[PDB]
């Protein structure tokens, strides 16, 4: 009953329903891995369809408390309390959580999203204030029985609370360690383009930290592993020539409908850190992933996509685009994080996303930055 409970696209976030207060109130709640947070829409909006009137519910308790959140994109102020809360396409179950109500608000809420409110499912590490706020997926573990443990299939898509939903998944799964608790901090050890290594230090993969993160659309590369990567990706593809702008995410790119040239863009290989010394996994995504459609009737005589790719000086992000079409599983109990393809995989009849190993390297070095 908990297969397909999400909506959404990479762009704009995947959203669940969850209700908030007593009596209930209904909200689409973004999931978020990338922060720790949960907040909704408490005041009037223009991009919010609806939000959460603490005057309403009986339940609510105010902890006389402001609190502020910036993310890459957007920010937010709010007030923080807690109160009931449940999720309708869920485990059936009623928790007590903190809740930041969201007042004032720059680039967050997106215009046409159907979400008003955010989900940070990571640890309290990174909370704000600090982490002395628990947060949500820590307090529906410690007051009611689901075990310790999350997966999300993005496509629409499923958030499986408590476990693992085999028909969600096919072949194995790959285990890469969480190496500290606070992102769902990952370590690269090897970044291929057509099978064809970047050749770097590894540490470089994860300058400064490298995390999984279902609240940003984008793959995003520490600069120096962007420029390689970006050099790869257009010589692969130099068969057809971009402006400077679309490689920059600055620009579409468009073909008549139908015709988009997967075939010139190479595949790109992400290795994960194993659970044994000098062991690796890689996933591979295709072009299908890493170049975004944007939807627009206005463009709809050609297929136009955004290059979803970008530049970071916080580390690697592994967003939504390279999370579609592969189970991941946030096995918080092992501190590990699991991928295998997804029953949504994309793959076209010449290619296929895909999650395989194992790979060794003959080199010792550790490829965590710090
Ligand atoms: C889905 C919307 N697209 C979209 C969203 C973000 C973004 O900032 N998402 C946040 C949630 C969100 C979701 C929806 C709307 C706003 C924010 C995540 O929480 C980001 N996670 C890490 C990187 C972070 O900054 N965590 C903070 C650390 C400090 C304490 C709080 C948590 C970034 C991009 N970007 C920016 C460049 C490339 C890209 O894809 C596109």
């Given at each position: 009953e908990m297969v397909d409970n999400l909506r959404g696209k990479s762009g704009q976030g995947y959203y669940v329903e969850m209700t908030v207060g007593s009596p209930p109130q209904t909200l689409n709640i973004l999931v978020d891995t990338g922060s720790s947070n949960f907040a909704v829409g408490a005041a009037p909006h223009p991009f919010l369809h609806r939000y959460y009137q603490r005057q309403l519910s009986s339940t609510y308790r105010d902890l006389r408390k402001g609190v502020y959140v910036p993310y890459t994109q957007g920010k937010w102020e709010g007030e923080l309390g807690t109160d009931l809360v449940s999720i309708p396409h869920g485990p059936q179950v009623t928790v007590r959580?903190?809740?930041?109500?969201?007042?004032?608000?720059?680039?967050?809420?997106?215009?046409?999203?159907?979400?008003?409110?955010?989900?940070?499912?990571?640890?309290?590490?990174?909370?704000r204030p600090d982490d002395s706020l628990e947060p949500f997926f820590d307090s529906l573990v410690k007051q009611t029985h689901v075990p310790n443990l999350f997966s999300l299939q993005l496509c629409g898509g499923s958030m499986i609370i408590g476990g693992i939903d085999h028909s969600l998944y096919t072949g194995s799964l790959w285990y890469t360690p969480i190496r500290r608790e606070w992102y769902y901090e990952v370590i690269i050890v090897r970044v291929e383009i057509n099978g064809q290594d970047l050749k770097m230090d590894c540490k470089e993969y994860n300058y400064d930290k490298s995390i999984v993160d279902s609240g940003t659309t984008n793959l995003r590369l520490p600069k120096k592993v962007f420029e390689a990567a970006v050099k790869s990706i257009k010589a692969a593809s130099s068969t057809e020539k971009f402006?400077?702008?679309?490689?920059?995410?600055?620009?579409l790119v468009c073909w008549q409908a139908g015709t988009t040239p997967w075939n010139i863009?190479?595949?790109?290989?992400?290795?994960?850190?194993?659970?044994?010394?000098?062991?690796?996994?890689?996933?591979?995504?295709?072009?299908?992933?890493?170049?975004?459609?944007?939807?627009?009737?206005?463009?709809?005589?050609?297929?136009?996509?955004?290059?979803?790719?970008?530049?970071?000086?916080?580390?690697?992000?592994?967003?939504?685009?390279?999370?579609?079409?592969?189970?991941?599983?946030?096995?918080?109990?092992?501190?590990?994080?699991?991928?295998?393809?997804?029953?949504?995989?994309?793959?076209?009849?010449?290619?296929?996303?895909?999650?395989?190993?194992p790979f060794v390297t003959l080199d010792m070095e550790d490829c965590g930055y710090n």
């Open positions: 959580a903190n809740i930041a109500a969201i007042t004032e608000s720059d680039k967050f809420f997106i215009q046409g999203s159907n979400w008003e409110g955010i989900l940070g499912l990571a640890y309290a590490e990174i909370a402006p400077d702008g679309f490689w920059l995410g600055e620009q863009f190479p595949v790109i290989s992400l290795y994960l850190m194993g659970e044994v010394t000098q062991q690796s996994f890689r996933i591979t995504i295709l072009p299908q992933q890493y170049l975004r459609p944007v939807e627009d009737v206005a463009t709809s005589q050609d297929d136009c996509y955004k290059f979803a790719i970008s530049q970071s000086s916080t580390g690697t992000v592994m967003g939504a685009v390279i999370m579609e079409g592969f189970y991941v599983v946030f096995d918080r109990a092992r501190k590990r994080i699991g991928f295998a393809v997804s029953a949504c995989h994309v793959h076209d009849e010449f290619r296929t996303a895909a999650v395989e190993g």
